[PDB]
Amino acid sequence: HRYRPGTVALREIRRYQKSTELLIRKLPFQRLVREIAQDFNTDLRFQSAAVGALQEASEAYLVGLLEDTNLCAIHAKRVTIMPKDIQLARRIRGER
Amino acid sequence: PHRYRPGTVALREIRRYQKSTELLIRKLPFQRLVREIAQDFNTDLRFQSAAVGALQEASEAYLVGLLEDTNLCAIHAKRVTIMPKDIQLARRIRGER
Amino acid sequence: KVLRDNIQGITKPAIRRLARRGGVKRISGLIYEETRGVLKVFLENVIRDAVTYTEHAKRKTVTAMDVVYALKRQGRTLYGFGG
Amino acid sequence: DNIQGITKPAIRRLARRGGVKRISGLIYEETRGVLKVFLENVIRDAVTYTEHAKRKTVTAMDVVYALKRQGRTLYGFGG
Amino acid sequence: AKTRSSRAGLQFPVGRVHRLLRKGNYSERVGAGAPVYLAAVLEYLTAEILELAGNAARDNKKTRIIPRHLQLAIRNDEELNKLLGRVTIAQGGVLPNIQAVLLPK
Amino acid sequence: KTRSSRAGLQFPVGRVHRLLRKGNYSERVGAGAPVYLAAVLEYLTAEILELAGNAARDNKKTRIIPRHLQLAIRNDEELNKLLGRVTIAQGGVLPNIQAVLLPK
Amino acid sequence: RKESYSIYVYKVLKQVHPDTGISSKAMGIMNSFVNDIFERIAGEASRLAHYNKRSTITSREIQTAVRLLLPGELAKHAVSEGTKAVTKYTSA
Amino acid sequence: RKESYSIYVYKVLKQVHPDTGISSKAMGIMNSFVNDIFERIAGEASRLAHYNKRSTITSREIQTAVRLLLPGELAKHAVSEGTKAVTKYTSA
DNA sequence: ATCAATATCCACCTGCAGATTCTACCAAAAGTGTATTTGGAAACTGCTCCATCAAAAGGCATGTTCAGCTGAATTCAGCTGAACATGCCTTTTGATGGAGCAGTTTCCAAATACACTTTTGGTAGAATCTGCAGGTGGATATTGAT
DNA sequence: ATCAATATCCACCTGCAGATTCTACCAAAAGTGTATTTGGAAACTGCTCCATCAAAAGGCATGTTCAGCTGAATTCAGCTGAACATGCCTTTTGATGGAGCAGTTTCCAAATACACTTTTGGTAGAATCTGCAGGTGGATATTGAT
C-alpha cells in the first residue's frame, strides 16, 4: 500500500493547522539566535523566555509569509510555491 | 491612414505620466466625491481647499501604488493586463482585506 | 444641490492615467469599477477619521491638518500640507 | 553554520501550517535567508534595548519592544 | 471608604488606571472621568474576548481556556480580528483553512 | 551666545528644548538632549538637501521643487527606507517600466 | 512588585462564564491585550489633547480615541459602556 | 505665529548647495520632514525612558532612539554629528 | 460499488503538573483640606469659504476596426512527494557555580522654578529672477512598403 | 535591412508674470543669574536565573528509490482591449459678495493638582484541588485498487 502524492500533504496541513506547538527545534534555533546576536554584541546572555519569544515571533512570521506565498503560487496557476512567489509576497508586503 | 500598433502609445503614456507629478483626477469631480462622502458622514461639515487637495494627493498616491502592486501581480501570472483578481490579491497581501 | 453617485465622476481615462503612472500597459474592462470601489473605501476611511477629529475639536470645517492626522492614523503619512 | 540547522522538514512543517501543498526544492534556502534577515533586524533592535539599559542579558521584554517596533506586536511574553 | 471601581460598577481598577495615566506621560492633567471610562472600555473588550474564547473552549470540550481558544475567538470574529490584525498570539496557531484549488476533485 | 552657536549648529537647540518640554515625552528634559536631537535633525536635513540639489541640477534646475525631493528620497536606499511609508505631495514616482512590458 | 491584571480578568471571566477557567499563558495573553489597548487608547488621547492645545485628558478624549481606534459596533458598545460607567461613577 | 523650520533649512541648503534655491511647496515638505523625524525620535526616546523607569530624557536616550530609528550609515553619521555637537556644547 | 489497508475519531480512565484558594505584609488608593489652572460662557472681529457668472477649452464619452493577447488544450520530461531503512542529535532531568541582576542607602552634579534683560524669528511691503509656455528646427522612433 | 513618410521627442531661445529674495520693525521666545529640589549614579550585596556538564533514550532527520503528477513549452482561435477620429459638455479659472466661522480676550465657577494622614485591596508564596495530557481499543471514515 502506498498513498498518492498530495494526499499526505493535505493530511499534514490539517494536522499542523489543528495543532499549535512550535515546529522548529528549540536547540538549533537557540544556536542560531546566539550566532546572530553575537555578531551584534559579543558577551550577550539570553533569557529562556527571550528565545521562546523569538521562536514564536519567527514561526508566526514565516507561516504568514508562507500562506501569502501560497496565494501567489495559486494566483500564477501553480500548486507549488517557488522563490519567485516569496519574493513577490515580500515586495508587495513592502518588506523590500 | 497611419496607426500605431497597440501598446506603443500605452508605453509612451507610461513614460509621460511617470515623468510628471501633476494630479491625474480632475479636481471638481473629486471634490464633489469627497463632499458627498463627508456629507453622508456628517451634514454640516465644510471643507478647506487644502483639505480636498491633501485628500486628492493622498488618494492618487495610494491608487498609483496599488496599481503598481497590481501590475506586478499581473506580470507574476504571466499576463500583461491587470485584472480585478490582481487588485484583490495585492490588497489581501498588503493586509487591506 | 443634492450630491449623488459622484464616485462615477472618477472617469475611465483618469483611472487609466493613474494606471500609466503605475506602469500598467494593458487594462481589463472590469478594472475601472473595482478601482472606483477601492478609492471609495479608502476615502470613506480617511474622511471618517478626519471628520472624527473635526467633531472632537467642536469645529464645522474639516481642515488640512484634520486630513493629515487622519492619514497619519491610517499609516499613510503625508508631507506638504502643514503636517 | 547553524542557520542551516533549521531543517528541510521543519520548513516543510511551517509550510504545512501555512496551507502549502507542494514545495519547490529551491524554496528552503530562500526561507532560511528570510528567517535570517528577520532575526537580524529583531535581534538588532532588542540588543540595542539591552545595551541602553546597560545590561548584558537580553530579556523577553527587549524582544517584545523590538517586535513592537517592527510592527509585529506579540502577546503572551510581555508586557 | 469604598473604591472608585465599585462606584463605577466595574471589576477593572479605576485607581490603578488613573495612576498609569498620569505617570504615563500622556498629559499634564488627567480628568476624573477619564480613568473610569478607560477602565470600562478595557473591561468590556476583555469581556467580549473572554466570552467568545469561553465559547471556543466549550466547543473543543474544554473547561479551561488556553491560547488556542483565544486565537480562534479573535480570528473567527471580524471586529476583534481587525482590532488585532497586526498582533501575534503566542501558542495560538492558525485557523484551519485550505485553498479549494489544492483539494482533490 | 545662543546654545545653537555653542553647539556649532544651524538648527535652534532652544526651540527643540521647548518642543521637548511641551511634548509630554518625559517629566524632565536633559541639557544634552535638545542639542543632540537638533544636531541629528540638521544632519538629516543636510543629506536630503544634498541629494535633492543633485536631482535639481541633473534636471537643469536651480530651484528645488518637490519632484527633486522625491527623486532624492527614492533613489537613495536609506532615505527611501526611512520614508518608506511617507507620501510627498507633487513628488510623483520613479520612472520604472517592467522589462516584460517593453516591446520586443 | 509585578503589578498585573490577572485578578480583574479572572473576575470578568467568572462574570461571563462561571465554570470556565483560564490557563497561565492565556492569562498572559489577556494581560498583553489589556496593556496594548490601554496604550493605544491613551496614546491617541494624548495626541488628541495635544492637537487641540489642551493640557488635560478628559473622558471626552478617551471617547474620541475609542471612536478612532475601535471598529464599528465594537466601538459604539465600548462608548456606551464607558458613558454608563462614567455617569454611574458621578452619582454618589 | 506659525513657527517654521524654514530659516534653518534655508541656511543648511546654502551650506550644501550655495546656488540652489527652493520652492514654497518644497520647503513645506521639508518642514513636514523635520517635524516627523522630530516626533519619531522624541517618541522613541520617551518610550526608552519609560521602559527603564527614568523620568528624564538625556542625550543618551536621543542617541539610542536614533540608532533604533535610522538605518545603517544614516545612523552612524547622525550619531557622530550628535556626539560632536554635545561635546562641543559641553566644552563651550 | 465493494474489498483490504491505513488513519481518525470518540469513549473511557487516572495521576500530576499546574491551576485555584488560602494567609499575612505592605505598597498604594482613598480620604481631608488647600493651592492653582483652565476650559468654556459671551462678546467680536477679520478671513477664508460657499456659490455664482461667463465664457472657451480640452477633456470625455461613443462608435468602429483590428491586432495582439488571454485562456483552453496537449505533450512530456523533470522533480518532488511517499515510504523506508539507519543513525544522529536533540530532548529530558538534575545538579552546581556564580554572574549579572535588582534592592537599599547615600549624596552631588544636573534639572526645575522665578524674574529680568536681550535677541530673534515672523510678518508685511519693497525689489529681482526663474521656470514656463510657446515656437520651430533638428534628430528619433514607428510603421508601411521595395 | 533599407527607403520613405508620418508623428514624436528633444533642445535651445525668448519674453514675462508669478513667485522668490530682500528689507524694515515688534511680541514672544531665548538666555542670564539665584534659589531649591532630586533623580539616578555610585557603591555594596543578596538572589534568582543562566550556562555548562553528563548521560540515556527514542524521537526525527538523512539519504535513497522510484513513479505519478505538476510545470513549462507550443499551438492557436476567439474576442477583448488599444487606437483614433467625432462631437459635445463638463471642467477651468478669473473675480465678486455676503457670511458664517475660528480665532482672541476677558474673566470666573468648576475641576485638578498637591501635601499628609489612614485604610484595604493586591500580591507573594504555601496549602489544597482539578482538568487534562497521554494511553489504549474499538467504531467510522478515507484512500487506493479490481
Residue numbers in the entry:
A (entry chain E): 38 to 133
B (entry chain A): 37 to 133
C (entry chain B): 20 to 102
D (entry chain F): 24 to 102
E (entry chain C): 14 to 118
F (entry chain G): 15 to 118
G (entry chain D), H (entry chain H): 33 to 124
What do the authors say?
As compared to H3.3, H3.5 has five amino acid differences at positions 29, 33, 78, 88, and 103. We previously purified the complexes corresponding to the bands remaining after the H3T nucleosome disruption, and confirmed that these bands were non-specific H2A-H2B-DNA complexes (asterisks). These results showed that the H3.5 nucleosome is more stable than the H3T nucleosome, but is clearly unstable as compared to the H3.1 and H3.3 nucleosomes. To understand the structural basis for the instability of the H3.5 nucleosome, we determined the crystal structure at 2.8 Å resolution. The overall structure was similar to that of the H3.3 nucleosome, as expected. Leu103, however, is located at the interface of H3.5 and H4, and may possibly exhibit reduced hydrophobic interactions compared with that of H3.3. In H3.3, the corresponding residue is Phe104, which fills the pocket created by the α1 and α2 helices of H4, and apparently forms hydrophobic interactions with the side chains of the H4 Ile34, Ile50, and Thr54 residues. In contrast, such close hydrophobic interactions are not observed around the Leu103 residue in the H3.5 nucleosome, because Leu has a smaller side chain than Phe. In contrast, the H3.5 L103F nucleosome remained intact at higher NaCl concentrations (lanes 9–12). The H3.5 tetrasome was disrupted at lower temperatures than the H3.3 tetrasome, indicating that H3.5 associates with DNA more weakly than H3.3. In the crystal structure of the H3.5 nucleosome, the H3.5 Leu103 residue forms fewer hydrophobic interactions with H4, as compared to the corresponding H3.3 Phe104 residue, and does not induce substantial structural distortion around the residue.
The nucleosome, which accommodates about 150 base pairs of DNA, is the fundamental structural unit of chromatin. The four core histones, H2A, H2B, H3, and H4, are the protein components of the nucleosome. Eight histone H3 variants, H3.1, H3.2, H3.3, H3T (H3.4), H3.5, H3.X, H3.Y, and CENP-A (CenH3), exist in humans. The H3.5 mRNA is highly expressed in the human testis.
